[PDB]
Amino acid sequence: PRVKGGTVTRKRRKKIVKLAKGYYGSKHLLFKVANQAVMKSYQYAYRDRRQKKRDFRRLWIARINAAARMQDLSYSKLMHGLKLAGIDINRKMLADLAVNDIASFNTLADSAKKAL
Amino acid sequence: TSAKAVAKTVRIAPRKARIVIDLIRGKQVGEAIAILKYTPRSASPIIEKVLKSAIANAEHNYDLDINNLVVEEAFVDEGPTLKRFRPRAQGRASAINKRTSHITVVVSEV
Amino acid sequence: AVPFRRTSKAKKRKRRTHVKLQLPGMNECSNCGEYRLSHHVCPECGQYDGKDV
Amino acid sequence: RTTYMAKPGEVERKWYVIDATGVSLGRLSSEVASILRGKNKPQFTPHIDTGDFVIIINAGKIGLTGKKATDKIYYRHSQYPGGLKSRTAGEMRTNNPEKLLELSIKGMLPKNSLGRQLFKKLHVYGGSEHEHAAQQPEVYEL
Amino acid sequence: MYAIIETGGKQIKVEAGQEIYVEKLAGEVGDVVTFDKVLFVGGDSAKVGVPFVEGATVTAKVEKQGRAKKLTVYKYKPKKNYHKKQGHRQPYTKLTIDAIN
Amino acid sequence: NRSEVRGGGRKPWRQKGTGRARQGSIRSPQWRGGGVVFGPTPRSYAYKLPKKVRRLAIKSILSSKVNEEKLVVLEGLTFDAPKTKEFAAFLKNISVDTKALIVVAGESENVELSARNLQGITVIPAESISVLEVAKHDKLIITKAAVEKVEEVL
Amino acid sequence: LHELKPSEGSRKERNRVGRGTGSGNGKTSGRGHKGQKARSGGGVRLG
RNA sequence: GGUUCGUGGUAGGAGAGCGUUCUAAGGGCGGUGAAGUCAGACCGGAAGGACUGGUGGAGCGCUUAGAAGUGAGAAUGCC
């Protein structure tokens, strides 16, 4: 029996073109460039799930540095102080206190100074 | 509410019809007809007949006031292309698309 | 000599920003009551709007 | 998730006035770049501009160590063949100090659209008088 | 008053009545969960942990046991005829915080 | 295949210089009306397992029918004249109401005719009992005379 | 006849080459790259 | 069911599968709307699969097995 190439091809290519929604010009219309664009988007998203974790830690560290220098501490001294003092609060939580509850941040910065 | 006329498979390239149709889109029908009368393009007479047909449709089929009509919609769609050949140098033939247009005009009160 | 790349839709449309007609210079006549080109004779009346023929 | 992000016009931008008298051209510039960028505020958000406005006065008295006054050359190219012009840091500190400090700080700002907005927040004066008294600028120490 | 608790290899700030998502915990949708590792308590008397506040606990009730929105993970190496597609849905537990202690 | 398709003898255009892909025949398989590259060829699909395996298969399918209580042994089965109404009434009396293979020996030509127009019913000699015919049918109805003939062979 | 199960291990699905890179037999279809053994009808006589 | 050690990968070896047309048997859907087609924020580890609605206007799934003209993005491929 003959199997004509009916429907499976169109169904597969249309899914890839729909994943390219929002891309510029031919990239959201044409299977060949949409398929490249979608492969490349997935590769970037895979790389950026790792880079996102690095980026947010750099943001938190910069904010902790700013808040700590308002207490005559550098980030490097504060973090050493918190380690010696045995305080396990992570950079995401410290950066959150430094912005939203500076009084609490100052309490921890005191605990740090005491341990140094 | 509104009245449409269409001229299907008019033997004029759509780009050539569109550059004129763009002048009348949104105008009152009286001004639209004047604009077409004084735009020296091959498309102007063709678009005028579609517009006047649309206005007759609005007055006869839908008892609307011809004095109060605006060109609500006007567009040109590609019709089927006649394929022709022009002999060129060195035995080669080059394609010629004798393109056709569908010219739609919708008129409405306001 | 030849296009190195096909022209995109956007670029083609930008090029055509200036490919358009201007509205004709026209106005309603008094004697006729219909539109006419300025500095032309009005056929509706059948002569120049001002100077009778 | 939950990390704070500053919104445009959320963080109060303040006006600072900084005396440049004696400070190394860099050293002044590196500190000022940080103030413009907002790196000294916990609200620091990399995409927003939370920084402060900076007036530098006395830019004519800016410090240039070593033989930099004669040997530090600033180059411009017009993009015409052989259109390279040069000025010494010294000559520029004498005649165009506002330019000298702008060149020094521009190089230390992010090289992007936001970096170009930050540069607009810098006001340099050769002398001791600015015309920004309305902005009630507060003296800042390095 | 808010606490900072250690759940699922991460730290989270919790007030009472807040609805948090955490890594899958054992618990039916009724069950009450007790977080014992409290790093910090806030509000008018900051109790700081070295590293955990002795006796301090947050209680929460399990609202949902779910799988997050489908992620497709796709890798390829250009010119090496290598592609690898994988679906992912990360399990979570949606808790409502009841009481900081 | 590209040899069997009408025409296609000449090279469509010269190997080099025209700027077109090199082509050998207009009936090459990538051409629209061209030859098929492999595709069906007339062939037999028939094969027999060894005789001993074929005998075990008929013994085992017949034993299955007895285990499933799908085998009805009839004393006689005969009809005075070909009458489908009578054969249909018979199937109600025996309580079939399914597909059924009817195996008969004592010639009884009227059985074949009487059951010929019923849709799920097949009448066969006894010499002609096969694995696929027993498998194709739910109930197996067999005359005593036919059982004798089936056992005589197995 | 609607519940046929051939003896387990008696039948195996044939391998189809040149049907994409996922299978591991796509493109070159197990032949590697070029030379006489990559060609249709390719290969030297037995000994 | 646990424990331990593992899980980058081209040529390439090994395995398990998805989907397509056809056949058989069983069991179904369908003018109260089949296939196809369009849309969607649904489901599965992948190939893929549903559901709902529009269009369409008469055929088509599912289960288990079987057989193949069984899967395309590249051939200065052909139309």
Next chain:
RNA sequence: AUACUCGGGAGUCAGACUGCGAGUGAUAAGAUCCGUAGUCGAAAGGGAAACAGCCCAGACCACCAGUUAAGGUCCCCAAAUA
């Protein structure tokens, strides 16, 4: 924690640079030809501005957690104007 044996199926027979030991060369070559180790080839990640072959180090998937390696901590740019 593998070896060996017997069977089924392969691909490969253009290699590259780096370090070390030699020849050829001019004690030239990103040269050439061997030996020896590594990396690339077939290896993503971090560093070396950018940079297959160097330094660090091996990606099963998810996380807005943590600790380190080379390399770094005035600003661009995370960390010492230690």
Next chain:
RNA sequence: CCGAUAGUGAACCAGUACCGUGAGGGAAAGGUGAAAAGCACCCCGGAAGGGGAGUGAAACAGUUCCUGAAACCGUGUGCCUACAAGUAGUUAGAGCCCGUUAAUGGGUGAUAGCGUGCCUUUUGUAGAAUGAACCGGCGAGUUACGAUUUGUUGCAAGGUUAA
């Protein structure tokens, strides 16, 4: 076994048209509806073509008229855009606009970080090496008979028939 690029070259006035001095080469091209009931009549227009009205289950079935994808061409408009240097995404992200197979939702995207297509061929290619204008269809390990090896099943010092 094929189901209109298939199956004959040829489902249709095909060895036709067309090409060639000639031998010879050699296409494309199927589908209104159950029934013509194939749109009286009115209107604009020279006509074409439309809009009504009517027929019909349907006319967005209107004489090439089942379905009607994609490229491609347009109209409308929710968000963005005229100081910006862009393999066009991705991660972070305001603002604005929505409201779903109800989901730690959808559209858009100021600004910020990161980021040299795909394939082939190569020691090594973003490559200033190769191939592809785009979309669609078609387009490449098959079958027969032998050999060998593994799996399965039957029988077993036997096993098996060919014509």
